[PDB]
Structures are given as structure tokens and as C-alpha cells.
A = this chain, B = another copy of it.
Amino acid sequence: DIGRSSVRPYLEECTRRFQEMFDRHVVTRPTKVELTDAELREVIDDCNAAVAPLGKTVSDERWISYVGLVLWSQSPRHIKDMEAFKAVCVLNCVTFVWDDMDPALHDFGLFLPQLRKICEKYYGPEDAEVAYEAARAFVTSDHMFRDSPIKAALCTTSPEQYFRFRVTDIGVDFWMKMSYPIYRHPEFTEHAKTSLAARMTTRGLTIVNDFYSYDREVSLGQITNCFRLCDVSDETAFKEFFQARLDDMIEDIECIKAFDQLTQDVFLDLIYGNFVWTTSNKRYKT
């Protein structure tokens, strides 16, 4: 169905409605962390060093585009450890590269030691092991589920099964487990380590990403996108599905407000910051 090849007809209204929802339920805007020139050079140098064994040359412009996710979606008022912050910048960037690679070019023997080097550089020993395991689990999951029947079943059955897959696959469990050292906040550290932090934020991250990455993904034959569960060529069907997804986001956001003040700031800054970054990034345009 060529009518289902694009969500472009809904682009402007959906963007407006996402923003309206955030203004009504989160209110406080995300803020962009600013890196010094020295910090941004350090981050890019580490990204280039990590993907060089895989034969990939990545421009500064591409790295800076991927790093904007971290700059916009962390919680600047609560940052305590800028070394952990740089680590998340590097790890976020290089796993975008992995996510985009053909699996024939994936090489664990070459890439996993680079992830370990990044973690050992920026984290103390215990946190380094936690961040590295989460990175390893994510890149392994991305690899093993390429064209997988498990992925097919979880992504075609219901929203419940799909979001369950995405807790790992969209990277948010990884994100929380490498981000808690930024904040040094005992409650958030526990929610990161139980993955409750990831489970609370999966839908709000995923629904936004899926909307803006739909056209690209379906053009590439990728099935990991919740809007494939609906007939996007039927305007009534799309409207009902989109509203059900907005309701999921709102329910999660209202439950996130029961968490402690710092933790809920981190969770909400992540979901809203991802939206601000997604709508500004050429990755998601045509």
C-alpha cells in the first residue's frame, strides 16, 4: 500500500499536538547543555577512535547532529559529573553508527573493546561495568534481531508487545544505565538499575521517534515502528491511533510525576528533549 508509505500528511498537525501536550503536562522546557570547544573535540575524537576499526568515516557535522540528543535530553540543572556526561555523548553517537550499519559490517571483536575503553575512561570501576554491560547488551540486541521472527511477532501483534521490545531496542535502558552517574542521585540510580526508569520513559520516546522516523524506516524495509500497526492511509484510523498514543504518553507523564523531584525532572527532560531534538534533526526529514 503506497498510501501507507508516509505519514507526511500528518506532519504539521502531529508536531503541533505533541508540543501542545508537552506544554500542558510537562510545562518546563528542556535546556541545551553547552559543550566547550575542548569538550566537543574530546567527544568527537573518542567517537572517531571507536568506529575507526569498523572502517567508518563520520563527519563532524554528523557527530554533532547525533550528540544533540544528549545535549537536549539530559537534565542540566541536576548534572554533577561532566565526565559521565561526555561518556554518554560518545556512547550515544557511536551506537547510532551501529544502529545504521548493515549487520554484515558489524564486528563485535573490534567494537566491544572500544566500548569498554570509553567506559573505563569516563566512569569509576563499578559504573564502568554497568555502562559497558548495557552498551554490550544493546548492540548485541540490535544485531541479533535484524530480520528476526521474534522481532516480527513483537512488532506486529499489539502496542503492548511492541513497546515491550522497545524498552531495550530504542536504547533507553542503555541510556539510563550510562546516565545515572551524571546525577549521583541514589533514587535515580536504583530506578536506572531496575530498568523501571527505562520502562517509564519507553512510550514517550518511542512514539515520538516512530512518528518522525516512519518514512525513512518503511522505505528501508524496517518494521520496528508502532505506526505500522495502523493504516496510516486511512485518516480516521490514523487519528484514532495517534490519539491512543498521545493518551499513553500522558498517562506515563502523570505517573512520572509521582517519582521524586530530581528523578521526575530527568525522566521528563528526556522525553521532551528527545522531541525538541527530533524535530530539529535532518536525520528525520525526507
Which residues of chain B are within 8 angstroms of A187 by Cβ–Cβ distance? 144
Q: Is the CB of B251 within 8 A of A190?
A: no
Q: Is the CB of A165 within 8 A of B258?
A: no
Interface check A133, CB cutoff 8 A:
yes
Which residues of chain B are within 8 angstroms of A196 by Cβ–Cβ distance? 141, 164-165, 167-168
Interface check A199, CB cutoff 8 A:
yes
Number of interface residues of A (CB under 8 A): 34
Which residues of chain B are within 8 angstroms of A259 by Cβ–Cβ distance? 150
Determine how close the nearest CB of chain B comes to the CB of A191; give it in whole angstroms: 9
Q: Is the CB of A133 within 8 A of B193?
A: yes
Q: Is the CB of A251 within 8 A of B152?
A: no
Q: Is the CB of A144 within 8 A of B258?
A: no
A258 to B200, CA, bound (A): 26
Interface check A229, CB cutoff 8 A:
no
Given contact pairs A152-B258, A154-B255, A167-B195, enumerate 6 new A-B contacts (beta carbons under 8 Å). Answer: A137-B193, A141-B190, A141-B196, A144-B187, A149-B258, A160-B248
Interface check A153, CB cutoff 8 A:
yes
Interface check A81, CB cutoff 8 A:
no
Q: Is the CB of A150 within 8 A of B258?
A: yes
Knowing A190-B137, A190-B144, A258-B153, say if A164 contacts B251 (CB, 8 Å): no
Chain B residue nearest to A144 in the complex (CB) = B190
Contact check: which of B140, B161, B255, B258 meets A251 at CB < 8 Å?
Answer: B161
Interface check A46, CB cutoff 8 A:
no
Seen from chain A, the residues whose Cβ lies within 8 Å of a Cβ on chain B are: 129, 133, 137, 140-141, 144, 149-150, 152-154, 157-158, 160-161, 164-165, 167-168, 173, 187, 190, 193-196, 199-200, 248, 251, 254-255, 258-259
If over half of A's interface residues share one DSSP class (helix, strand or loop), that class is named, otherwise mixed; here it is: helix
Which residues of chain B are within 8 angstroms of A254 by Cβ–Cβ distance? 157
Q: Which 10 A-B pairs have the closest CB atoms?
A: A153-B258, A168-B194, A164-B199, A150-B258, A137-B193, A153-B255, A137-B194, A149-B258, A161-B255, A141-B194
Q: Is the CB of B258 within 8 A of A190?
A: no
- 7 A-B pairs within 8 Å (CB atoms) are namely A137-B194, A141-B194, A157-B255, A160-B160, A160-B248, A164-B200, A168-B195
A258 to B153, CA, bound (A): 7
A161 to B199, CA, bound (A): 9
Q: Is the CB of B193 within 8 A of A251?
A: no
Determine how close the nearest CB of chain B comes to the CB of A186; give it in whole angstroms: 9
Which residues of chain B are within 8 angstroms of A152 by Cβ–Cβ distance? 258
